Every structure is written in C-alpha cells, then in structure tokens.
Symmetry: D2
Subunit: 231 residues, 4 copies
C-alpha cells in the first residue's frame, strides 16, 4: 500500500521480472519493474558514487553512478512527481540480498530539497552507532567503521544472504507543493558493494515514500526492500 | 525533567525573578534566570531578526537581535554545551503570554548545525497549514498568512493572555560528539511582536532541548514555555 | 559567444520576436532558439530562475510574479559545444526608442563541477562592489540596487541605454572529465515604464571572460549581440 | 606594504624571531611574530586539515588543525578585523621553504564569507585543482594540476621538495570582508594539506591569509617569512 519512487542500483538481473540481462541502474515509479534502465558496470569491492537529481521545471528524474577512472552510467526519465507522490514524504536508502549476496555499505549520504524558499539539507559522511536522525528498518545498522550497513554483515566482514534493511531520514520532506514556483531535490551517496561469490545480489536504492513507509514482508532479494511483489 | 538552553527575547520584566527592569535579551542555561542579559529596545509592531551562534572552539553562545535602522542588542556567554546538553537534541522556538500579552509571530526560521563533516540545515520562509517537519506544542499554529503563531491570536488579529506554544524541528540534531574536531550551529529567525495596549508580554525564545522535550506544566507567563519553575 | 535567457519586454517582429513579451533562450543570436509568452507586469517585482545540468543538457528558465502564473521555457543544448570551458556570468539590460527601469534587487548563482563549487549571492548591492564588473550604463548602490540601465535622480528610465554586470571571478562551466556539471541563477527585478511601450528587457548571460558590450547593442540587441543575425 | 592577517601552520621554530621552540600554529596580525600560538604536533607525510573561523559578533579569529586519530591543535585570538583590514580583500594560501624543506601540498580548499545589514555571501570549494585554474591567482613557485593538487612550493619530478621556495594562490574575486552597515559578518575557511620532508626539522610552513586585493609576494619572504611578510618586525 506504500507509494514508492526509487533509483535502483540493481546488481542482479532478474529477467523473469523484466530486468535487462546485465547489472543496471533504473528508475522505479510504483513498481520494481523500472520504467527506464541503463547498463551498469558494477565494480566489486570498489567505492562508487550515485547522484540523483530532479526539478519541477523539467519534470525529469536523473541518476548518474560512477567509479573513479571508469565511464559512468546514467539514466533519466520524464515524470512529474506531483502526480505520483504525496506532498510530504520520507527519503531513504534501501538494500537487499537473496540467494546471492553482497555488502550494501553506505559511506556517505547527502540530500537537499528546495521549495520556492523553504529548504532541507542533510549530510552524513560518518554514521554513528546511535544515529537518532535516521530511522533504521530491518537489518540496517550504523556505526561499524562509521558506516551504514543496510544489510547484514558478519564480524569477519562477510555479507549474509536474504537480508533487507533501510535507513530513512527522520524528518518529513515537503517534496512538492501546487503553490510553489520551483521544487527540486538532489541526493548523493557513496557505497561499497563487495561479494565473496562472483555473483553479487541484489542492489541498493535511493527512494522516496509515504512518511509511514515500512519494509514490506518478503521484500528480500529482487524486491530491494521496496515492493511487496514483482508487479 | 527537561534540559534547556535558550536565548530569550524577554518583553516583560519580572523583577521578582531576577529579570532586569527593562525588556532584555538573555542566555538561559537550565534556568529562566538568565546567565547574561542585555538591554533590548523592543519595537512594538516592527519585524525583528535574531541571530544565534555557537562553536565548540570558542565555546561561546552569542545572540544578536536587530530591527532595520536601529542599533542591535547583543549578548554572549561562555559555556561548554558538551557539559550542559545531551549529545542529541531538538531545536525550537517558544513563546508565552500571561496577564499581559502580545502576538508572537514568526515569519521565518533557519538553522544550521555542523559536526566534523556531518550537517543539518533547514530554512522556513513560509509556514503551511500542515507543516509536517515541525512539532507544534501547546497553542502554536501554522498557516495564518503563511506564518507561525506561537501563541493564541483571535480571528480579529488580537493576542490572548495565558497562552504558551512551541515549534520544534522534527529531526533530532547531533549537537556535540567527543570524537569531533569542531561542532557549530547557528539559527536565525524573524519575528513580529505586536500588543494593542502598552505593556506586552511575555516573550520569544530560541531553544535547544532533550529530544523528547515538552512544554512544562504551568509554564505560561514568565516561564516562556521553557521551565517548570523559576529556580 | 553568448548563452542567455532573455526577459524580452518588446516585440521586435522585424527580427523574429513573437508579437508579445516573451522569455527566451538565446544561443549565440538574439533570435531565440525557444520562446514563451510572458505576462510581464509593469512595475511589480519579478523573479527569474535559471537552471542547467550536464546530465539532462537542458537550459530551463522560469519567470514569475507573486499571485500570477509563471512563464517557463526550456531548450536542449550541450554547453560543451557552445561555450569555452571558462566563462563569466552576468546580467545585461537595454533601452532604445522605448525604455523601462532595468533594476536588479538581487542575484545569486551557483555552479558545480563533479566536487568544485562557486556560489555567490547579492541581496544588497553597494556603491563600489568590487566583485562585480560594471559595463556601460550599469550602476550600483542607489537604494542598494543594481541599475543595469540609466535612471534619473527621481527614478525615470532613459532611452538608448545599455549596461551590464558580470561576476569578477571566472566560472568553470564545463570540463570534459566531469561526472556532473550544473549551474543555477536567480535574480529578482523591477521593470517599470511610464506607458505601455516598455523596452527592451533584461538577460542573464554567459560569455567569454573578456566579454564587453558589443558596439551598437542598445535596444533590441539587449547588450548581448553585435548584429541581429 | 601589504596588510596581512594570517593563520600560520609553522613547521619550523625560528626562535631568534619569536617562535616558540616547537612546531606551532599561530595567529598573525600584520607581523610574522604571532599574537598567539599553540603547540602543533605536525605529522610528516600524513594528511592534515585546518579550519579557520571568525565572526563579527565575538571578533575572535580561531583555528583548529588536526590529523586523523590525533588530538587537534587550536588557537584563538581576539581581534576586530574591521580595524585591521580594508573592507575588500583577497584570500589566499601561502607557503615557503628555506634551508630546510617540505612539500606544501594542498589537496582541498573551501571558503565562505557572509555579510548582513538579507545577506551577501561568497562560497568556493576546490577539491581538485586543474592545470589552468583561472579562478586562482598563482604567485611565485605555486602550481596546480599535478595529481589535481595545488603545490604552493617547488617539488622536483621525482616528488622531492626544494629549499628556498615560495608560492601562493589567491581566489580571483575580491571578498567583502566587513562593512560599516553590517549586522553580522563572518567567514570560515577549510584546507587539507600534506607536508612531507626528508629532513629531521621540516620547514617552513603553510598559511591561510587575508590581504589587500593587490597583494604580491614581498621580496625576501622565503623561509621563515612564509611568503607573507617583507621582514620579521
Ligand atoms: O539474490 C539473487 C536472487 O536470488 C533469488 O532468485 C531471489 O532471492 C531473488 O529475489 C534474487 O534476485
Ligand atoms: Ca534485480
Ligand atoms: Ca520576563
Ligand atoms: Ca525584443
Ligand atoms: Ca617559523
Ligand atoms: Mn532492476
Ligand atoms: Mn528574562
Ligand atoms: Mn611562527
């Protein structure tokens, strides 16, 4: 029953539910089946950066994911978020593992949202063990090497399967308003995805939800902690 | 029992509880009896600005209150907030009326905090009828002309006695941390205090509190919605 | 070499303006690559907001007044192919046979590349504003405002004026190795006339770091263009 | 002569001109002889961060310098900049070497200044310095681009630092640092740096400075004078 808009960094192609047949970034409007995707050369054990932008003038959600010294992956999609989301939302990071797995480690996260001005800005370049400005859901924890581990990792530092977790910014965010002339947001995060396997799964997403969003039961694996099913 | 740090814009001298005998600005560290005050030439019905700053290097809380084309009032007090406040806090605006009254209208409020870097910034230049990133307490309301009315005003614009209200930012703020090299915050608000009669009361404060802080029982009047008694 | 967003108050149909006040995106020519109709409000304070990023490669602008519907215009353009890597940014305005005040009450700009950034904000302009280059008739400090074109002691705008203000620091507007490049500008303006016939308009622009007012660019050319091609 | 206000990270103790006998950070108001200093445990080859703050309410120039996992050094001095500097300035980083030497490598530099009277502001941030960085004025031996860093003083192709070098980098736009009619004025600066040396007592240091707009390196200002002062008065 939640409403979700997300940008997904999908490490595991589930072609049975529409993923293209490679690792990819996508834009998800109310479904795990991305409205748009682009090919992504995920680099195991390397630190990448994701950058998500939107404004109400162009009505265009874009994302760029990059690693140092590599060509970046970019995806864009036309959508007026006033038609999808409620006026007030929470914003968050989600990740999952399944039969296959990976660390879903978040090293930094920033966000800015403006409504013309009213503004909200936060930045985490370090997460503490007791991060009262985050709502941690599922298996997500903070504080180990000052990072946000969205899914379960053991002490020896090895990722566990079938895990799901999220972190939402505590304050509601006014993401759109009819009376506003311009609304915009941007989000940045740095992430470290490492697998012992060879086959990493399942991904990390930046998402925007109704304020009371919770992890749907069963949303491990291909469902990214975002959706109750694959419709 | 709440922990409070506040900067008060005190319109009504209660000489019997240690107010000086003129309107004043004050720094309150866990007591309504200001640790330092300065004379404040309040201007009934004009828009004022208050600016509050602190950093962990100087460990000095200062405040400056001004009106266009008038001399500003400044107060400062040396205090190590590390030994006063909890590590995580909420920030807020509070006001009250008693036997005597006034409007306690907030036209704008911004805050920035930094911990080295993690950061939180917000800015309100307009308040809406349903401002979900604020916790309104007591008599506080939003949406009347796009402003925050901290105390009761009638439909005819006139302020009411025996009122108390507060507005806190929804997200906790990490105000200090021992591992941190430098911590700083600042806050700015613009306010409009009108009274029909001579003699307005009781005042406006910017405050910092334990996360779960609430209006103390009985704290209309002299206690500014901050303190349970006049100790 | 000019990219600009014009707030065109005077229809010059002679050279391809539409028959109504318009906003437009100008890429190297006063003949806008895209326009939109604009219900300019004579003597009210307006706001212009301009945005571009290198992911979308879309230059967009919105102009509005309180309690009025806004005007918006966009144009796809890759600034990598139109501007040098380093530029200056500014505001320009003109009058000719008709006239208007071209008063700037505020101006802010942010640019970002990858992370390198520049931000500035003027809400008040001073008599001797050393981080601006004033060109032509532009002056600062009267009531704390920037007057891009001539105004008399009592406030009457003068015909045949041109003036501009550029931020003193060069701006790094694109770099081929950047992941994301972006800018935004916002200004608030007061364009007033003693009749209808107000002219000629205000523009936010991006040029070469040595750009000066081209010769004979009063009027229709908004202080931006050497000819009407 | 130029008017200079500076926060110095002084690696070399020139006790004959008033340095304490240890590496130190200090506040310099028109003289290389600091108004105030604190001991600084400089760490050869580690990346350090410096943070400089000032506001016109408290009128106290403070600085904190630090390294990961070490205690930071801090220094503060009460001084009203309105009395010392002209109203418009440029801001800069300077460094020098002498008989002894060190890399004076700047990896990042950010600055913000604000004035009220509803505010004017200027912010810049460099996390990368490019070969041809037109919003910087480079003076003396200073160069940009090598590994995207700003090298204030001369380093050989094999990365070894040279003695007797001086260089500076100033932001191109003038800064409105104070104004008569301002309710509050403030600035902060942050930079990260790498000082590596072969020698046992590295020299001479790095400084964040604020100067007249037309400031240039004074004659004879290598070594202990940090590219900032014509002499040791
Ligand atoms: O983990 C990879 C893959 O494994 C299984 O098939 C499920 O858990 C999917 O939901 C997931 O995509
Ligand atoms: Ca998948
Ligand atoms: Ca009182
Ligand atoms: Ca025209
Ligand atoms: Ca020395
Ligand atoms: Mn997918
Ligand atoms: Mn009092
Ligand atoms: Mn010294």
């Amino acid at each position: 029953a939640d409403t979700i808009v997300a940008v997904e960094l999908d490490t595991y192609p589930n072609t049975d539910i529409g993923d293209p047949s490679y690792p990819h970034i996508g834009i998800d409007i109310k479904s795990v089946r991305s409205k748009k995707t682009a090919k992504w050369n995920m680099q195991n054990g390397k630190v990448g950066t994701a950058h998500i932008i939107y404004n109400s003038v162009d009505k265009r959600l874009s994302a760029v994911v990059s690693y140092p010294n590599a060509d970046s992956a970019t995806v864009s999609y036309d959508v007026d978020l006033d038609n999808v989301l409620p006026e007030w939302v929470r914003v968050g990071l989600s990740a999952s593992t399944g039969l296959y797995k990976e660390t879903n480690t978040i090293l930094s996260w920033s966000f800015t949202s403006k409504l013309k001005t009213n503004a909200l800005h936060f930045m985490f370049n370090q997460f503490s063990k007791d991060q009262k400005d985050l709502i941690l859901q599922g298996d997500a924890t903070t504080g180990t090497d000052g990072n946000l581990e969205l899914t379960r990792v053991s002490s020896n530092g090895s990722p566990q399967g079938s895990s799901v977790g999220r972190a939402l910014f505590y304050a509601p965010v006014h993401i759109w308003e009819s009376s506003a002339v311009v609304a915009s947001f941007e989000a940045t995060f740095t992430f470290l995805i490492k697998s012992p396997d060879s086959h990493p799964a399942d991904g990390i997403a930046f998402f925007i939800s109704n304020i009371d969003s919770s992890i749907p039961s069963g949303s491990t694996g291909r469902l990214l902690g975002l959706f109750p099913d694959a419709n």
